[PDB]
Write a protein that binds this ligand. Structure first.
Ligand SMILES: *[C@@H]1O[C@H](CO)[C@@H](O)[C@H](O)[C@H]1NC(C)=O
Ligand SMILES: *[C@@H]1O[C@H](CO)[C@@H](O)[C@H](O)[C@H]1NC(C)=O
Lengths: 50, 99, 78
């Protein structure tokens, strides 16, 4: 007999990006000023996601 | 690096002198033309094709080796995924220093 | 894992092909070997000498282009 079998495999997932400034301090200038010295952590996160 | 170079030299010498038999066990000597004939026979081509066109096949082999040599002397990004490893390690350590 | 390991190597004198009345005879599978008396054909992984016949070999061309060809005879059963 001749049989045909199916096999399904994932290849990719969704590409995503975050913006630290809006997630942490949404439209607040004082919070952004206090966040200004955490920039290495956010550039590390953005490098990982990209 | 000298130890790894010695390992690769041993592998290339064993391939050029013994063939395929030094992985299954003890090395068996065989002249290189006969080893080439078996490799040709392994892909469905009879060995008279090798034995009658040996000059052309040898010349094409030498020409291909020279092209590989010429490609690596010009600045390019052929080894670009080996550079990424050292770049990533250096960047991680410098990020630890700056944080 | 149960595996097969060959052993007890032996040296023979070998040739790529044999010439016989202006024709080149190549083996089907195996190699031509010489053990000091006469020429046989054998499998590569085990030593079992066989008589060089027309069934073992095939013909392609004449014997002036192949490097290392020798003169010998091929036994026809008929
Ligand atoms: C070569 O092989 C043949 C096979 O019959 C044998 O008769 C002969 O004695 C062998 N010669 C040597 C030197 O072993
Ligand atoms: C035997 O071989 C030699 C060299 O390969 C060749 O010159 C000679 O013609 C051969 N014998 C015959 C009968 O063709």
């Amino acid at each position: 007999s001749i049989s045909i079998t199916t096999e399904v495999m994932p290849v990719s997932m969704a590409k995503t990006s975050v913006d630290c400034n809006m997630y942490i301090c949404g439209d607040s200038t004082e919070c952004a000023n206090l966040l200004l010295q955490y920039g290495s952590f956010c550039t590390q996160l953005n490098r990982a996601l990209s | 690096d000298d130890m790894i170079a010695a390992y690769t030299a041993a592998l290339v010498s064993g391939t050029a002198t013994a063939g395929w038999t030094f992985g299954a066990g003890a090395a068996l000597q065989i002249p290189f033309a006969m080893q080439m004939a078996y490799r040709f026979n392994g892909i469905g081509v009879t060995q008279n094709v090798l034995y009658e066109n040996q000059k052309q096949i040898a010349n094409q082999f030498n020409k291909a080796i020279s092209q590989i040599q010429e490609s690596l002397t010009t600045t390019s990004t052929a080894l670009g995924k080996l550079q990424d490893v050292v770049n990533q390690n250096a960047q991680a350590l410098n990020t630890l220093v700056k944080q | 894992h149960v595996t097969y390991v060959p052993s007890q190597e032996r040296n023979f004198t070998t040739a790529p092909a044999i010439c016989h009345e202006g024709k080149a005879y190549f083996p089907r599978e195996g190699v031509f070997v010489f053990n000091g008396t006469s020429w046989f054909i054998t499998q590569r992984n085990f030593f079992s000498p066989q008589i060089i016949t027309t069934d073992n070999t095939f013909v392609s061309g004449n014997c002036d282009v192949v490097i290392g060809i020798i003169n010998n005879t091929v036994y026809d059963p008929l």
